[PDB]
Design a protein around this ligand. Structure first.
Ligand code: HEM
Ligand SMILES: *[C@@H]1O[C@H](CO)[C@@H](O[C@@H]2O[C@H](CO)[C@@H](O)[C@H](O)[C@H]2NC(C)=O)[C@H](O)[C@H]1NC(C)=O
Ligand code: A2G
Ligand code: MAN
Ligand code: CA
Ligand code: CA
Length: 343
C-alpha cells in the first residue's frame, strides 16, 4: 500500500500511524530524542500490559485486560496504585494525542513505547501491531511489581500474567538501560539506572553487578539499595536478580553481547504489548516504526566506566566468570540526572 505521504506499508490501515508518528516525534519526544518522555513512554507499556491475571480470573474476579489502554482510560484509579507512582503525568502527556488521532489508547501506548525505543541508539528494530480494543474496566491493584518485592514474588507475578519464565523476566528488565528514577529518592528526580540512559546497551547489566558502596542522594528509601556509582540509583529487585542463582547467569549473559540483548528484547517487548490480545486478530504495522540507530563511536559495546574495574564486580554467575571488559580512561564521573518531563 502507498500512503498519502508517499511512503509504502504492507497494510493500508497502517498509513494513519505516520501522522501519529510525525506528531509525537516533534511534540512529545522533542524532535526524536531518547530523553525523559521516551523513557516515561517505555515504562507506561509495562504498567499498562502486565496488569492481567488468569489466577484472579479463576477465583471469579476480573484480573485486568493486559495491553488494553486501561491505565489511560481509568487513570484516576490506576495511577493512584503505589507501583504506578509518577504515571499520572505520563498519561496526562499522552492522552491528548490519543483523542486527537482517534486511535485506541492501548494501541497508542504500544506505539509510543516502540517509537520511544527507536529513538535510543542501539535499540532493536521495534514491532508495532494494532487492534487493542478500549479497556473494559480498570485493572485491580497488586499486579505491578514493586522495587521491594522478592524475587519469588516477581517470578510468580510474570508466570501468572503471561506465563513468562524467569529468563524472560531478565530480558524485559533490559528497559532499565534507558531509564531514570524520579520517585524513590525524595530528594532528587532523574537518577539513571545505568551510566548510558540515552543508549540501549548492557551497561545496566554491568553496573548493577558492581558492589554497592554508596547512596547517590539520600539513604533509607524503601526499594533502594546502594549502587557503585555517584549519580546512579539501584533498586532492590535489580540488585537481587543480578545475584539470585535463578537469574544471575542470565543477567550476566548480556554483558558484551549486543545481539542477544537486542534479539531477546525485541521478542519480549512485542509479547508484553500483546498481553490480553489475540496476535492473530492484530495487524502488523511494524513498517511504520523508524529504523533504529546504531550506538555511535567505535568503543567496545560493554565496558567498565572510568574509575571502575573488574575487582568492583560481585561475581554471582557460578558457571561463567564475569567477562574482562576495558575500563574507559579517566577519573570517575557522576552520572548526570535526567530531569523528568516538565508538565
Ligand atoms: C520487577 C519488575 C520491575 C520493577 C520492580 C521496576 C521498578 C522500577 C522503578 C522503581 C522505577 C522508577 C519509577 C519512579 O521512580 O516513578 C522504574 C522505572 C522504569 N522502568 Fe521499571 N521496573 C520493573 C520492570 C520494568 C519493565 C519490564 C520495563 C519494560 C518496559 C520497565 C521500564 C521502565 C523504565 C523505562 C523506567 C524509567 C522511567 C523514567 O525514566 O521516567 N520496567 N522501574
Ligand atoms: C551472545 O549470546 C548468543 C545467544 O546465547 C550466543 O549465540 C550462541 O553461542 C553458543 C555458544 O558459543 C552456541 O551454542 C549457539 O548456537 C549460538 N546462537 C544462539 C542464537 O543460540 C553468542 O555466543 C553470544 N555472543 C557473544 C559475543 O558472546
Ligand atoms: C555462563 O554464561 C556463559 C555465557 O557467555 C556460558 O554460556 C555458560 O555456559 C553460562 N553458564 C550458565 C550457568 O548458564
Ligand atoms: C553526581 O554529579 C552529577 C552532576 O555532575 C549529578 O547529576 C548526579 O546526580 C551526582 O550527584
Ligand atoms: Ca491495562
Ligand atoms: Ca544504557
Amino acid at each position: 500500500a502507498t500512503c498519502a505521504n508517499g511512503k509504502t506499508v504492507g497494510d493500508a490501515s497502517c498509513c494513519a500511524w505516520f501522522d501519529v508518528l510525525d506528531d509525537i516525534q516533534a511534540n512529545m519526544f522533542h524532535g526524536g530524542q531518547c530523553g525523559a518522555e521516551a523513557h516515561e513512554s517505555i515504562r507506561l507499556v509495562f504498567h499498562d500490559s502486565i496488569a492481567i491475571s488468569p489466577a484472579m480470573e479463576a477465583k471469579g474476579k476480573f484480573g485486568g485486560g493486559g495491553a488494553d489502554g486501561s491505565i489511560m482510560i481509568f487513570d484516576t484509579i490506576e495511577t493512584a496504585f503505589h507501583p504506578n507512582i509518577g504515571l499520572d503525568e505520563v498519561v496526562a502527556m499522552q492522552k491528548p494525542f490519543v483523542q486527537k488521532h482517534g486511535v485506541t489508547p492501548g494501541d497508542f501506548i504500544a506505539f509510543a513505547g516502540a517509537v520511544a525505543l527507536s529513538n535510543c541508539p542501539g535499540a532493536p528494530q521495534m514491532n508495532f501491531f494494532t487492534g487493542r480494543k478500549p479497556a473494559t474496566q480498570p485493572a485491580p491493584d497488586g499486579l505491578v511489581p514493586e522495587p521491594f518485592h522478592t524475587v519469588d514474588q516477581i517470578i510468580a507475578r510474570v508466570n501468572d500474567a503471561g506465563e513468562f519464565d524467569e529468563l524472560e523476566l531478565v530480558w524485559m528488565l533490559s528497559a532499565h538501560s534507558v531509564a531514570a528514577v524520579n520517585d524513590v529518592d525524595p530528594t532528587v528526580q532523574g537518577l539513571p539506572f545505568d551510566s548510558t540512559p540515552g543508549i540501549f546497551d548492557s551497561q545496566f547489566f554491568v553496573e548493577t553487578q558492581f558492589r554497592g558502596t554508596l547512596f547517590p542522594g539520600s539513604g533509607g528509601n524503601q526499594g533502594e539499595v546502594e549502587s557503585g556509582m555517584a549519580g546512579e540509583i539501584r533498586i532492590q529487585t535489580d540488585h537481587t536478580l543480578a545475584r539470585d542463582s535463578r537469574t544471575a547467569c542470565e543477567w550476566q549473559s548480556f554483558v558484551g553481547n549486543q545481539s542477544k540483548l537486542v534479539d531477546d528484547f525485541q521478542f519480549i517487548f512485542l509479547a508484553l504489548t500483546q498481553l490480553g490480545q489475540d496476535p492473530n486478530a492484530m495487524t502488523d504495522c511494524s513498517d511504520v516504526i523508524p529504523l533504529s540507530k546504531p550506538i555511535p563511536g567505535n568503543g567496545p559495546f560493554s565496558f567498565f566506566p572510568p574509575g571502575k574495574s573488574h575487582s568492583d564486580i560481585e561475581q554471582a554467575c557460578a558457571e561463567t566468570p564475569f567477562p574482562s571488559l576495558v575500563t574507559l580512561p579517566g577519573p570517575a564521573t557522576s552520572v548526570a540526572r535526567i530531569p523528568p518531563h516538565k508538565a
